[PDB]
Design a protein around this ligand. Sequence first.
Ligand SMILES: [Cu+]
Ligand SMILES: [Cu+]
Ligand SMILES: [Zn+2]
Ligand SMILES: [Zn+2]
Lengths: 153, 153
Amino acid sequence: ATKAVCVLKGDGPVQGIINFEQKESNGPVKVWGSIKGLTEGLHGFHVHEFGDNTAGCTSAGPHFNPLSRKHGGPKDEERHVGDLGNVTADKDGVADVSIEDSVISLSGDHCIIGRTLVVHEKADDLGKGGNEESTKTGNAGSRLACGVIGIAQ
Amino acid sequence: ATKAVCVLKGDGPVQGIINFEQKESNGPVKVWGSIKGLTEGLHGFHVHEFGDNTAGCTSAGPHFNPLSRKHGGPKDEERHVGDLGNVTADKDGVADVSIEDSVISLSGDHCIIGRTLVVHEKADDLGKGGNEESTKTGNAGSRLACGVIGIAQ
Ligand SMILES: [Cu+]
Ligand SMILES: [Cu+]
Ligand SMILES: [Zn+2]
Ligand SMILES: [Zn+2]
């Protein structure tokens, strides 16, 4: 069924292609692809509200959050729609992303097409950091690369 | 009002920012902004089907055509939904765009969000070129710059 794709680019070396596949209407979405040029280890990874790159990744806005909840990890009921948790880069700085999520969608109210995928400087603390920033952004730091999510075939 | 935005970029100097605004879901869309780095004269300007920039503008596919019609000008009844005609660059290579269109939409089963806006090498002959290429692409030639159309605040 629906497919989407996103090319990640930023001001530094981080870049990559992420694919989205949703076989059934409001079934789970498979998210996979490769991002390079990352530091080894965990990096926050979220869908942000606006597909606006006019000021690089800053104009993407906050995490996509149509239900007005607090930040969390993807396994949590209390999360943003766009909270996809972390991706892990290996010792050569490559993240072979492989996620399945059933809260994002490629259609309807939780649709992420037209919005911005962002990969971050640091790990997402999944809302467990005990400060207000943790339940807003997970303390994942700056936006290293981003791309608008587009319809694919 | 629904709003969208597109940052156009390519392998050459052509780049620009195009805004979209649609006050009513069943009303027209206003399209405006600027593109620079163009030769003076007319340049084809269309929404292509896929918001896939993995091969630059090449992976965007053909003009967005959900109703399976021939290529035309924006004011023709026979047109692709993606056909927005020509933009005009001045002698400084700058095209100031201001279009209103009532066939494209920012919502509904056939909206253009998540698709790719493309500005071309040559003029679009609006499907009146008298050859099979004309009723496919308008003879507008290569794709100089493009971007995925994203949701804006
Ligand atoms: Cu983020
Ligand atoms: Cu085109
Ligand atoms: Zn979040
Ligand atoms: Zn066309």
